[PDB]
């Protein structure tokens, strides 16, 4: 009947999942971690591993003037009372999560400056998020080769490049080492959750595919599903009304297809926010995929009418949401980023992965021209509107003020730029370029409804015993907002920890 | 006649070239740097930026027990008296080069452990080489985007990945910022030396292609040619008898085609060591290129007879030279690296660039099999020999001693191995299938033959006389190291010292 | 005539002096540093090496929300307009000093939390001061053995203990290595300034004793005198009306006897603030010296009448100034710190150097008793007043409020303490102890009048050509205030730098 | 009858004792720790807290190429088959001890480079030992003040200096916090074991003095005696034939007077190796005591005949043993360390505690002179021999080779030497006067002879049988290392492994 048995079954291997697994395994509960693909970490591995866990011992070490209450105030100011109990659990539990994790020899974080994303009471203009320290891959042995590589390697048929493991690779490599060190955890790759097993109304285990064979794994205390969102599943996204496209998602291709959300729905779990994502502008690639565009430091962006319609320096989720709001049957998706040869043909932003300009020009995702009139012809933009847009923006750059969209009036805008306003630079030294910008995502954020301890709830608010969800398998407490750097990982980690604690009671 | 004029004309933009440029420009000499391609740095940018500049203030700050004389002793012990004057200039000048460079706010180095490569008096088992600190690209402005990206990006149609600039990218980014900061230097890309201009027997400038137009650039004090070797030029390699192949070279494809060496020969420069390179084993790629294989930590290697013939843990140049020495009509090039599934299908070494196993297996550069007999059939190796080779190696791993090739009896062999191995961290049994065989070819990190030079980088004629106004350093010059790669950073260290000395000579 | 020549002659080898020397030597000026004793560093070597240099790249790395203007506002709020130009130069120049120093491979700093000392607009409750990184003594070669050792070694006939060089020893060891690295500087020990040499009204060099021989050293650009204060000169202190005593000073015994201040007076330099010091409470030692008492976390303090008279948690300079104000009798100098056995007999504060309780008890600097009545008899304190004082304090601890002196109503009070108020802890588990507390100092702060570039001024405000002063050789811009951690070193370093820059013009 | 009762009674509070206590208390056994003095930690607190626990998770996290088997090979190569079972238990159990301890939130270690002490198969030239992380005293509350301070404070009437707790202070502070955190342990100071209580041939408890009153404490599972060696007991040392002197021992004055070893003998425990110690050269102090001399980086050493007789750069135990071997009725004890004014009068080594040169000169433990002839007169050395010895050594320094004692031919010798020496960083000419001679005596870091034990720490009788209920570890026990100090951290590492194993045995 049962192929194996454990106390805590964890589905997925991102930051949340591994934090849940660690929490369970470190207090003596036998734990099995199931990863679908041949690598641990998912999108978490791709990430910069900024983590929004405020008011902890990490920020105390840095002498940061902030607190749990200040962070609570910020969330409340942005999110309102919707999900206030989960907002409270999120900020209140951050210190304990960080304390537990840093008690492991394989884990250490530090504060790294990066501004919160909205002007509101409680905002930190320099940020409050933390990051794992760089990791020498030699220091975790055979685990390094099981961590998913960064986007710049993973989508070009490559494994890790020669430096240290940084960002998400450090996060996942350190979490894995921690989980392994407990001696209470079994880490499996190529093991796919297919359905949950329910007895007398309680989730008691799961059915799983690996090795072509199907298995049944018993979970005495519970199942934590932290297996990502629906971002890779075009059908679910289209049914939910999610903007963007699977092909533009920055999740690992084919990994996060909503399997855990579906398995949860099948046993009665309610869902929410399925039309929402962690949005970002994406630089369209030759193969139809996208690259995360972050840290804009020049150029401007136009809709298909050749006009500016947003502050290009906006945090990525707000940028993406403005694309979607402006879009009318494709007038803003794609949009076009217009820039000159100031950076030798390079686009003035950080693009992940970072495809050379020559490949884009060869494929036609970018076009270049000696004049704006010619650029307009090649892109389908109106020449007069485009010329007029650029002249107006260049006047704004001269004055150092953008009266139309107020670019360069916020610490986030200034943060990425080294004239009168560092964020406003004239577009004037040809050749000129236009890059297609699409509506990408860093995962979706809709999913199973959960309570403050990660328990999956039915439509009436009752808890499905034995079943927990966190990360993008769960509907985010953040609703339509991306409050600052590290919220996706921070929420994932806090609720995975709380789920494991609940299972331990 | 002249399109522009400067005091010091530098051809190339690797570590050496930029160090020469900095040295000239920082003491007031107007300098022009010509880079052939659209990015600065060449192979130097690809490098790990380990630099063998011993006995300097950098190693003092690490409390390293070493000195100029200890380093001199090591070179002498390996190289003998051949080029002893240039050996002396190399070690004696290192401290002044480092001191000059670290004076610049854009440049700082630190010691990083990595062992010297030969057992000899003066060897540092932990190393003595230094590296530039990681560099936030934001700290050098628009120069970051002009630095050539790492191999793992540059050969897949990509620009820099998101972290800091490290290794060669930090080296070149910092050097460029230093050169720019002088206010005496002009840095040019897509500018190609075609020939040297000689008046009354003196090199007085150069002819250069850029923008489809040809230019003539006057050099009042001299021309420093640090434009790399012949690695990318199959013809020059074949004429010279150089082993390996241009496509297997780890230099940037098409950059280093021996142009400066040819230009030097054309004005009377003598050459030497043209059959020599900085060799390394390369993991054959699906497209016929190679990947630098360094830091071997498992597996074994066989020739086409299914037998071991070298210590697989040898420093890369010695490994390469052993392939070439063993090779008889292709019996050792390619060789086959045999490994098991201990690392989940990964090859137990550092491969640059790091192509995923699945691509290799799809292309057939690697083959996998559940047994050795089958692995032998898929590679052409004799099954009995292969099986026997692996059993014997596995016995050696059990005992912790390799009596046949003495692998794991040297700090270099140990340095790259992970913990919790056996008796000998370099000897790990090949026993948990599936088993794999990867083709290994004779790659290079540049060639090291070229124009004959003196202690101040001046290009010499066959009779030993100096061609006035003409200097060479880096792989445009014949290396003082001859047939030896003494330790980490010798190619960059020699390039940097002699570029500095050339610029100092021009300043007299 | 002249024994040697240099561009810049620096007298002293504390943080200021070496920073001045570095600034000169790093831009090509030949520099000679003269240290009186056989070790470099003076009191600076003894220090914790907290440095109040606000709004620099160091605090930017830590994401600290502060700025030059915020720091300027704080000084102005405390100090008023007296010395406003020098207040401006101090805060405005801090970034450049830090930038120059961190450009040297031997120097790096980091922010370390430690609150500013007064409630006022611009205060950083977590601080804004910075510290040199720990230094492995092996990394600076033979220089390590030329750095003065910490107080816990230096006053017991010892050289450096085995760990890294930290605090002032790291500051001085890194500054020395930086100065040496320039190849433009000569570092001399056992070389004592005796008088300045003036030609045509310009200071052109100095007369110096070393090796029993007197020398004359020519200074082409100038002489920087950063040779400490008058703290070790009982006569100068008495003449000036400086409270405390030379033996109680935490300066190195006999080093800082006001030599440079006298030499300056002798060529026409005006002086100011000579009755002022950087004050601190000191734990009286068996040999009549003192130990810096900092980070009070328990106990209470009484005058000779057995009554509390100050907030015992005050920053040290305010504590010291309150002792002096209350002491119109020897009634407050000594005072008595009353504590119980909560810390096993240890005094609840940090004492530098840290003499064992058993030595104090043996010498009678401390007394112990099973009751307060007996403690009073052994100390001379009135028993009833003492008992009553402790009971009242204990009631305050119970309520969590000290109505009499408002202890525990400030971030500085809280910072050092791990009931209702962490700073108020009942004194109730015997045996009970009384330790004598005297009015110590961390150097005096009166001296030669100087301008924004460190030039020594005459009584009419005119500058004595060729002559500069900084650190405690100079009258501090801070007047009667110690604004926060690192002001003594920060002012010393900024004005030494500015002096060297002025000499370079 | 019984004053109190516990499952496991631990005598002593050094690293071993507290590790035993933790092991017992963390798995639910009630534990009482008895410390004789008013501070916890003993010599362990004084130590650098290097710990030789190879092949554990700690060295894995540093990527160190080493293993259990490599370590086993090293011990076997030095020690031979004598105590091979205990050698095996030591290396095999290290990982589990580390794992258990690092599971506690108060404990974390890291690898720190420091070479193993002998040239032999399995030596790590960089070392394999680990150290506790620096500890903020605020993180363990009232326990910090109960930890014995470092030597540089403890022997001058001082408590902890102002930095973090490091070395032994960190080790003991973290262990204490871990023990306390179990909620199963009672930590007592000023509680002195006087004798063991035996019923029907089983040790069932102990008699203990504290508060002037005598107590009887029942131990249901057993008594672990980890109360140090005989180092502080001149009578026991003289009876055993131990070289050195109590007054020169680096143990805390009066703490380790062999009380547990005597108590064990009294109930039938056999003893071994009582004439052995963990030896070191000691710089003789004004008060007749000594200071650990480690990390020699200059000077030379002579016997009373003014001649060199050993490699001065030898690891401390080998240095000490060479003094003892050469000594003939005081010809080598004291020896004289001869040095010049290169370091301003400082002795070229690390001395713990670090008494200023002026105090030595004032007391006459050191003498200074402008010439070697005079230095000789003041020390009782022959002038000609001394002069000749120094001239010969200076020639060796010039050549960079010491043909007589081969100093500077080993990674340990090099490890402590600053840069920019000459040919050999360990050999520096003695030539810039004044010249100094410092008296060097035969100090110790504890003795290593004591009660015979098995792989689980059980005290054995002369016939090899185990005394039920009785365990010993650390220097209360005879060391498995015999006459050898294999590398850094062996005294603490053995103490900790056998204390853990004893507690595990008691838990069965
Ligand atoms: Cl983020
Ligand atoms: Cl190299
Ligand atoms: Cl301060
Ligand atoms: Cl040791
Ligand atoms: Na790539
Ligand atoms: Na001391």
Contacts of B465 (CB under 8 A, 6+ apart): none
Residue C175 neighbours by CB under 8 Å, 6+ apart: C15, C18, C19, C22, C107
- Taking an 8 Å cut-off on Cβ atoms, the answer to whether D63 and A136 are in contact is yes
Structure tokens at B151: 């191999």
**Could you give the 3-state DSSP secondary structure of residue B296?**
coil
Angle at D102 (CA atoms; ends D97, D103), nearest 5 degrees? 100
Could you give the CA distance from residue B205 to residue D276 in angstroms, rounded to a whole number? 78
According to DSSP, the β-strands at D290-294 and D277-284 are: antiparallel
Interface of C with B (CB under 8 A): 103, 105-106, 136, 138-141, 177, 181, 183
| Nearest-angstrom CA–CA distance, C365 and D120 | 57
Q: What is the DSSP string of B437-463?
A: EEEEEEEEEEE--EE-B-TT-EEE-TT
Q: How far apart are CA B112 and CA B132, in angstroms?
A: 10
D346 CA to chain C: closest CA distance, Å?
8
Q: How far is CA B387 from CA B65, B307, B376, D12, D300, in A?
A: 47, 10, 9, 58, 58
- D322, D223, D337: which is closest to D290 by C-alpha? D337
The whole-angstrom separation of Cα A279 and Cα B449 is: 54
Option in C352, C356, C358 nearest D162 (CB): C352
- The tokens for B85 are 């004057």
Look at strands A300-302 and A335-339 and give their pairing: antiparallel
HSE on the CB side for C41, CA within 13 Å?
29
If one counts every other C-beta atom within 10 angstroms of the C-beta of residue D359, the result is 16
**B206 pairs with which residues across the strands?**
B196, B217
Taking the C-alpha atoms of residue D346 and residue D324, their distance in angstroms, rounded to an integer, is 26
Residue C301 bridge partners (DSSP)? C337
Name the residue among B497, B483, B481 with its Cα closest to residue B84.
B481
Burial degree of B241 (CB within 10 A; 0-12, 13-18, 19+)? exposed
Q: Kindly give the distance from the C-alpha atom of residue C142 to the centroid of ligand 6, in angstroms, as a whole number.
A: 22
Strand segments (E) across C125-241: 130-132, 185-188, 192-199, 202-210, 213-225
Cα angle A113, A116, A117; round to 5:
135
Whether B418 sits inside 8 A of A157 (CB atoms) is no
Asked if residue D193 belongs to a known ligand binding site, the reply is yes
Contact C8, C224 (CB under 8 A): yes
Name every chain A residue with its beta carbon within 8 A of the beta carbon of D109: 105
Question: Which two three-digit tokens encode residue A158?
Answer: 């490559």
Alpha-carbon distance of A355 to B211, in angstroms, equals 25
Both tokens of C373, joined, read 């009545």
Q: How near does any CA of chain B get to the CA of D339, in Å?
A: 20
Residue A118: is the preceding peptide bond cis (ω within 30°)? no
C-alpha distances in Å from residue A165, one per residue of A161, A171, B45, D468: 9, 9, 20, 53
Q: Do D344 and C145 touch (CB under 8 A)?
A: yes
- Helix (H) / strand (E) containing D7: strand D4-11
Taking every pair of C-alpha atoms in chain A, what is the biggest distance, in angstroms? Answer: 74
Ligand found nearest the CA of D160: 6
**Whole-number Cα distances in Å, A40 to A45, A81, A130, A171:** 8, 36, 21, 11
Q: Tokens at residue C228, please?
A: 């400490």
Look-up of token digits 């870091």? D445
Residues of chain D found within 8 Å of residue A183, distances taken between Cβ atoms: 99
What subunits touch chain D, counting only 3 or more CB pairs under 8 A? A, B, C
Using CB atoms within 10 Å of the CB of residue B262, give its burial: 0 to 12 exposed, 13 to 18 middle, 19+ buried. middle
Residues after which chain A is discontinuous, using a C–N cutoff of 2.5 Å: 418
- 8 Å CB contact between C47 and C171: yes
Q: At what angle do helices C487-504 and C15-26 cross, to 10 degrees?
A: 30
Three-state SS across D176-242?
A: HHHHHHCCCEEEECCCEEEEEEEECCEEEEEEEEECCEEEEEEEEEEEEECCCCCCCCHHHHHHHCC
Cβ pair D46, D151 in contact under 8 A: yes
CA distances from A263 to A318, A476, A496, A497, B357 (A): 31, 18, 18, 21, 33
Q: Judge contact between B101 and B178, C-beta under 8 A.
A: yes
Residue C166, Cα to own-chain centre: how many angstroms? 16
Q: Rounded to whole angstroms, how far apart are CA atoms B408 and D393?
A: 36
Count of other CB atoms within 10 angstroms of residue C426: 17
B166 alpha carbon – ligand 5 mean position (Å): 15
Strand partners, C135: C165
Interruption sites in chain C after residues (C→N beyond 2.5 Å):
418
User: Taking the alpha carbons of B80, B85, B90, B95 in that order, is the dihedral positive or negative?
Assistant: positive
CB A258 within 8 A of CB A233: yes
Method: X-ray
DSSP strand pairing (C185-188 vs C31-34): parallel
Rounded to the nearest whole angstrom, what is the distance from the C-alpha of residue D412 to the centroid of ligand 4? Answer: 13
Q: Can you give the resolution of this entry in Å?
A: 2.0
Cis bond before residue B353 (omega within 30° of 0):
yes
Q: Phi/psi of residue B180, each to 5°? A: -60, -40
Separation CA A239–CA A262 (nearest Å)? 13
Cα distance between residue B504 and residue B501, in whole Å: 5
Per the CB < 8 A criterion, the answer to whether B473 and B70 are in contact is no
3-state helix, strand, coil in chain C (%, to 5): 35, 25, 45
Alpha carbon distances (Å) from C265 to C116, C272, C444, C469: 34, 11, 17, 12
Question: Which two tokens mark C197?
Answer: 């040499």
Ligand 3 centroid from CA C51, angstroms: 7
Residue A328: burial class (beta carbons within 10 Å; 0-12, 13-18, 19+): exposed
Alpha-carbon dihedral angle through residues C448, C451, C457, C462, given to the nearest 10 degrees = -170
**Residue indicated by tokens 């020969």:** B265
* C107 Ramachandran zone, left/alpha/beta (phi>0; psi -120 to 50): beta
Pairing assessment for the beta strands A31-34 and A4-11 based on DSSP bridges: parallel
Rounded Cα distance between C128 and C123, Å, is 9
- CA max distance for chain C: 74
Q: Tell me which residue of C371, C505, C495 sits closest to C16, measured CA to CA.
A: C495
From CA C500, how far away is CA C468, in angstroms rounded? 9
Are the Cβ atoms of B65 and D417 closer than 8 angstroms?
yes
Q: Taking the CB of residue B199, how many other CB atoms lie within 10 A of it?
A: 9
- CB burial readout C313-348, b (16+ within 10 A) else e: bbbbbbbbbbbeebbeeeebbbbbbbbbebbebbbb
CA dist C497 and C56 (Å) reads: 15
B504: left (phi over 0), alpha (psi -120 to 50) or beta: alpha
User: Could you count the other beta carbons within 10 Å of the beta carbon of residue A82?
Assistant: 11
CA atoms within 13 A on the CB side of B157: 14
Ion ligand 5 neighbours (CB, 5 A) are: A 152-153, 156; B 152-153, 156
Distance CA A349, CA C92 (A): 33
Integer-rounded Cα Rg, in Å, for chain C is 23
Q: Rounded to whole angstroms, how far apart are CA atoms B394 and B429? A: 5
**In terms of Cα–Cα distance, which of A503, A478, A492, A491 is closest to A77?**
A478
CA C281 to chain centre: 13
What are the helix and strand counts (H, E) for chain D?
Answer: 15, 19
Phi-psi region of B183 (alpha: psi -120 to 50; beta: other; left: phi over 0): left
Give all domains of chain D, ordered by start, each with its CATH number.
1-294+441-508 (3.50.50.60), 295-440 (3.90.700.10)
CA atoms of D480 and D463, how far apart (whole Å): 18
The length of chain B, given as a count of residues:
508
* DSSP codes of every residue in A137-156: GGGGGGGGGGBPPPHHHHTT
Q: Interhelix angle for B168-181 vs B15-26, to 10°?
A: 20
- Virtual CA dihedral for A297, A303, A304, A305, nearest 10 degrees? -120
Separation of alpha carbons B280 and B272, rounded Å: 21
Percent helix, percent strand, percent coil in chain D, to nearest 5 = 35, 25, 45
Q: What angle do CA C423, C429, C433 make, to 5 degrees?
A: 80
Residue A229 backbone dihedrals phi, psi, to 5 degrees: -105, -155
Measured distance CA(C216)–CA(D182) in Å, rounded = 70
Helices marked H in C188-255: 234-240
Inter-residue contact B22 to B28 (CB < 8 Å): no
Beta strand B466-472 with A185-188: parallel, antiparallel or unpaired? unpaired
The answer to whether the CB of D500 falls within 8 A of the CB of D94 is no
Distance in angstroms (rounded) separating the CA atoms of residues A458 and A265: 9
Beta carbons within 10 angstroms of residue C497's beta carbon: 26
- B266 burial type by CB count under 10 A (0-12 exposed, 13-18 middle, 19+ buried): exposed
Q: Calculate how close chain B gets to C174, using CA atoms only, in Å.
A: 10
What residue in A sits closest to D65 (Cα-Cα)? A138
Collect all residues of chain A within an 8 Å Cβ-Cβ radius of residue D62: 139
| Burial of A392 per CB tally in 10 Å (0-12, 13-18, 19+) | middle
**Ligand 5 center from residue B37 Cα (angstroms):** 20
């Amino acid at each position: 009947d049962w192929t194996s048995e454990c106390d805590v079954l964890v589905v997925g291997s991102g930051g949340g999942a591994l934090t849940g697994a660690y929490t369970a395994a470190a207090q003596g509960l036998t734990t099995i971690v199931l990863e679908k693909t041949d690598r641990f970490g998912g999108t978490s591995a791709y990430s910069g591993a900024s983590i929004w866990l405020p008011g902890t011992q990490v920020q105390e070490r840095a002498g940061l003037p902030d607190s749990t209450e200040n962070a609570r105030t910020y969330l409340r100011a942005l999110l309102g009372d919707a999900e206030s109990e989960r907002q409270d659990a999120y900020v209140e539990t951050a210190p304990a999560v960080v304390a537990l994790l840093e008690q492991n020899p394989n884990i250490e974080f530090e504060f790294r400056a990066f501004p919160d994303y909205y002007k509101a009471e409680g905002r930190m203009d320099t940020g409050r998020s933390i990051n794992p320290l760089d990791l020498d891959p030699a220091d975790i042995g055979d685990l390094a080769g099981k961590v998913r590589p960064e986007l710049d390697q993973d989508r070009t048929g490559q494994d890790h490049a020669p430096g240290p493991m940084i960002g998400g690779r450090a996060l996942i490599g350190r979490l894995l080492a921690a989980v392994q060190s407990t001696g209470k955890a079994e880490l499996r790759t190529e093991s796919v959750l297919t359905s949950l097993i329910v007895e007398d109304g309680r989730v008691v285990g799961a059915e799983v595919e690996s090795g072509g064979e199907t298995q049944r794994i018993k979970a005495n205390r519970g199942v934590l599903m932290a297996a990502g969102g629906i971002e890779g599943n075009a059908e679910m996204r289209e049914q939910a009304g999610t903007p963007g496209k699977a092909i533009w998602s920055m999740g690992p291709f084919g990994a996060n297809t909503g399997d855990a959300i579906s398995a949860g729905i099948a046993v009665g779990g309610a869902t929410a926010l399925l039309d929402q994502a962690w949005f970002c502008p994406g630089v369209e690639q030759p193969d139809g995929s996208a690259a995360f565009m972050v840290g804009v430091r020049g150029g401007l962006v136009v809709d298909s009418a050749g006009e500016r319609y947003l502050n290009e320096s906006l945090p990525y989720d707000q940028f993406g949401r403005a694309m979607d709001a402006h879009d009318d049957n494709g007038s803003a998706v794609p949009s076009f980023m217009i820039f000159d040869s100031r950076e030798g043909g390079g686009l003035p932003a950080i693009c992940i992965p970072n495809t050379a300009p020559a490949k884009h020009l060869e494929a036609g995702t970018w076009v270049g021209a000696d004049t704006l009139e010619e650029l307009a012809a090649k892109t389908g933009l109106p020449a007069d509107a485009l010329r007029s847009t650029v002249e107006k923006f260049n006047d704004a750059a001269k004055l150092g003020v953008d009266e139309e969209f107020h670019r360069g009036e916020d610490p986030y805008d200034a943060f990425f730029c080294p004239g009168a306003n560092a964020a406003l630079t004239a577009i004037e030294n040809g050749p000129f370029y236009a890059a297609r910008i699409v509506l990408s995502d860093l995962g979706t954020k809709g999913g199973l409804v959960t309570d403050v301890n990660g328990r999956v709830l039915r439509a009436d608010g009752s808890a499905i015993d034995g079943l927990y969800a966190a990360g993008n398998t769960s509907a985010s407490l953040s609703g339509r907002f991306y409050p600052g750097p590290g919220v996706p990982l921070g929420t994932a980690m806090v609720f995975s920890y709380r789920a494991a604690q609940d299972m331990a009671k």
